[PDB]
Amino acid sequence: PMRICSFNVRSFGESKQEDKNAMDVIVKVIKRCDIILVMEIKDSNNRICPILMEKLNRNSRRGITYNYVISSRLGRNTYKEQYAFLYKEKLVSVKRSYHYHDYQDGDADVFSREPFVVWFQSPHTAVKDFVIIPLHTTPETSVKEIDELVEVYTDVKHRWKAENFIFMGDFNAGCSYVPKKAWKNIRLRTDPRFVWLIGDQEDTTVKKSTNCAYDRIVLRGQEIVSSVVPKSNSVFDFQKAYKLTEEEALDVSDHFPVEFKLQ
Ligand SMILES: [Mg+2]
Ligand SMILES: [Mg+2]
Ligand SMILES: [Mg+2]
């Protein structure tokens, strides 16, 4: 069974490479996953190659090799981020990737960080291919941004043959950003063909004082939905798993990763 993870790593820049403790936790988290979306990559050179070197040192299983695809730098101006997908080479490959663009009226309007959509081929799963649409919203505009994910789904269906979709990332989908009353105006929730694997009662925040399901996974496509391994869909508490204190865990990230498994 293949594990797919999304992980918001707070400010993953050159500085973070120097905290060996935090970096070792991040590597361990990645090593549990066959595909992992990493968000908040911030660098104008290369942080994604150091990570691959680190992950490919034990050249183990004569081939548990990892590769990556990374988006362009996305934002309004000086403040840019990248989405990266790290994946086990021998288990999946990238068929195509593109940056969503709204050809109608306002062209850079809704997303500050346009989804970097990636079409994966997966010869060993029941579902032979799927598309991952990642999103990292700006907190105060999460209602609109999450809602607009149905327009990305439409665009991808027009462009590619694809039937199976995974929407994942940091939607900021809780607490004061997306209150209970606002779910009514989000088509990604009110259309029930979209299946939510992380529910509104989950805690994706490392801090003990907060309990919000900021990070999410949503599927569409009857094939992929019915291929989810029962009980696999969860928050991975890396703090409890590696016996870290709150301070050590906050050095890694402010967010826990979310994940599920596919048959
Ligand atoms: Mg942040
Ligand atoms: Mg945030
Ligand atoms: Mg918490």
Number of domains making up the chain: 1
Method: X-ray
C-alpha of residue 211 to centroid of ligand 3, in Å: 5
- Residue 151 designated active-site: no
Catalytic choice (81, 148, 202, 259): 81
| Separation of alpha carbons 230 and 260, rounded Å | 9
Ligand with the closest atom to the CA of 205: 3
Active site residue 99: no
Residue 50 sits at φ, ψ, to 5 deg, of: -45, -40
Query: Nearest to residue 111, comparing CAs of 84, 137, 77?
Result: 137
Q: What's the token pair of residue 225?
A: 């939905």
Query: What residues pair up with 130 in beta bridges, in sequence order?
Result: 120
CA 172 to ligand 2 center in whole angstroms: 6
Q: How far does residue 172's CA lie from ligand 1's centre (Å)?
A: 10
Residue 104 neighbours by CB under 8 Å, 6+ apart:
none
Rounded CA-CA distance 52/86 in Å is 9
Domain boundaries, position 228: 1-263
Q: Look up residue 67 and give its two tokens.
A: 């590769």
State the pairing for strand pair 165-170/129-136. Answer: parallel
Token digits of residue 258 = 């979310």
Measured in angstroms, how far is the CA atom of residue 111 from the centroid of ligand 3? 27
From the list 170, 119, 129, the residue with the least C-alpha distance to 149 is 170
Residues 54-91 as b/e (b if ≥16 CB within 10 A, e otherwise) read: ebeeeeeeeeeebbbebbeebeeeeebbbbbbbbbeee
- Placement of tokens 């548990």 in the chain: 64
**DSSP string covering 203-260, please?**
--BSSTT-----EEEEEE-HHHHTTBPTT--EE--HHHHTT--HHHHHHH-SB--EEE
Give the number of whichever ligand sits closest to the CA of residue 169: 2
Read off the tokens for 33. 């996953």
Question: Which of helix, strand or coil describes residue 32?
Answer: coil
Catalytic one of 14, 40, 124, 136:
136
